[PDB]
Amino acid sequence: SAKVGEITITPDNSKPGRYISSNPEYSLLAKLIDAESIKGTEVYTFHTRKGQYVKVTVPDSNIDKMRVDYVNWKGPKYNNKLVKRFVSQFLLFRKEEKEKNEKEALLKASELVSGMGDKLGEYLGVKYKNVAKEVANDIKNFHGRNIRSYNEAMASLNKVLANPKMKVNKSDKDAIVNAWKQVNAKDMANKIGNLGKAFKVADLAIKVEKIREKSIEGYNTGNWGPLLLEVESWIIGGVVAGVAISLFGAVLSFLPISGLAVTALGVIGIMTISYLSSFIDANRVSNINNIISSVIR
C-alpha cells in the first residue's frame, strides 16, 4: 500500500502477485499489474485493455537489460523512457516489499518453532527444548543469501538419518503417517494464511498438500529428497528464501500430535527441527544428533 513516485501501488489482497495503480496515467495506462519473479528475473504485466497488455521483463532485476513486449496491441507503442520511468520505481518497491516480508516471516516462524520447543519439551525433555530454541533463533536471524542447496541440505539430513538411535518402529511410523493424512490443506492454508500478509503466497493450499504427500512418502520410504526438493521448488518459483522456510516451518509445526506416543513425538520433534537446520545451519545439525540419544528411547 506504498507510494511509487507519483502514484500509489496497492497489493491486491484477493490475488497474490497483483497490484493496483492509484492513477493508471503513470502506470502505463494500466490499473492492474501482475508481478513475477522466476529464477531472479522480474516480470511485469500491465493490463491495459481486455486481452491486451504490456509485458515488461527485467532480467536479474537489472533495468539495463529491460525488455518490453506489446501483446495484442492496437495503437502506438509507448516511448521507452516512459516505461523506464515507472519500472524503475516499481522494481525498487518490489525489492523493499520482499525484504520486509522476509523479516516478517522469519520472526513469526521463529516464534512457532520456539513454542513448539516449549510444548514438546514438556514430554520430550529439556535437552530437546533447548535445541529447538536455538533452531528458532537461527531462523529468526537468517538472511536469504545463505539458503542451502538441495544436495547440500540432503547431506546434512543424512547425518541425522544415519544416526543409529534414529529408529522408527511401524507402530510409530503408522501413527505419524496417520497424523499427516488427518491434515486438511485448506484449513491449514487458512491457518497459515492468518499468520500474516507475508504468508499470503500463491497456491498456498497446493504447497501445503505437497508437503503432506511428500511428508508421508518420506516416512514409508526413507526418501526425503522430494520434500527438500519441493521447498527449493517454491523458491525458484518466486517465493523468497526466508518465506519459503518460514512457510515450511509453520506447516511442520501445525501437525497434530494427538494420537502419537512419546516415542513418535521424539521422531517428529527431531525431524522438524532437522529439516529446518538442514537448509540453514550445517552446524546446528551436530547439536541435534547429540541429543538424539536422550530423546529417542
Structure description:
The protein folds into 2 domains: 1-97, Arylsulfatase, C-terminal domain (2-Layer Sandwich); 98-297, Colicin (Globin-like, Orthogonal Bundle). 56% of the residues lie in helices and 12% in strands. With 297 residues, it is an alpha+beta fold. It has 10 helices and 7 strands. A 7-stranded antiparallel β-sheet has the order 1-2-3-4-5-6-7. This is Colicin-N. It comes from Escherichia coli. This colicin is a channel-forming colicin. This class of transmembrane toxins depolarize the cytoplasmic membrane, leading to dissipation of cellular energy.
Concise structural overview:
With 297 residues, the chain is an alpha+beta fold.
Secondary-structure topology with pairs:
Layout: E1 3-4, E2 7-11, E3 18-21, E4 32-38, E5 41-47, E6 53-58, E7 67-71, H1 80-124, H2 126-140, H3 150-161, H4 170-181, H5 185-193, H6 204-219, H7 225-236, H8 241-253, H9 262-279, H10 282-295
Antiparallel strand pairs: 1-2, 2-3, 3-4, 4-5, 5-6, 6-7
Intertermini distance: 52 Å
Number of domains: 2
Largest sheet: 7 strands, antiparallel
CATH-derived topology of the largest domain: Globin-like
Strand order of the largest sheet: 1-2-3-4-5-6-7
Question: Helix tally?
Answer: 10
Helical content, roughly? Answer: 55-70%
The CATH architecture of the largest domain comes to Orthogonal Bundle
CATH class of the largest domain: Mainly Alpha
| Overall body shape | elongated
Order of helices and strands: EEEEEEEHHHHHHHHHH
Please identify which CATH superfamily of the largest domain we are dealing with.
Colicin
Residue share in β-strands: 5-15%
Count all strands and give the number: 7
Class per helix and strand makeup: alpha+beta
Q: Please compute the radius of gyration using only Cα atoms.
A: 22 Å
PDB class: bacteriocin
Keywords: bacteriocin, toxin, pore-forming activity
Assembly: monomeric
Entry title: colicin N
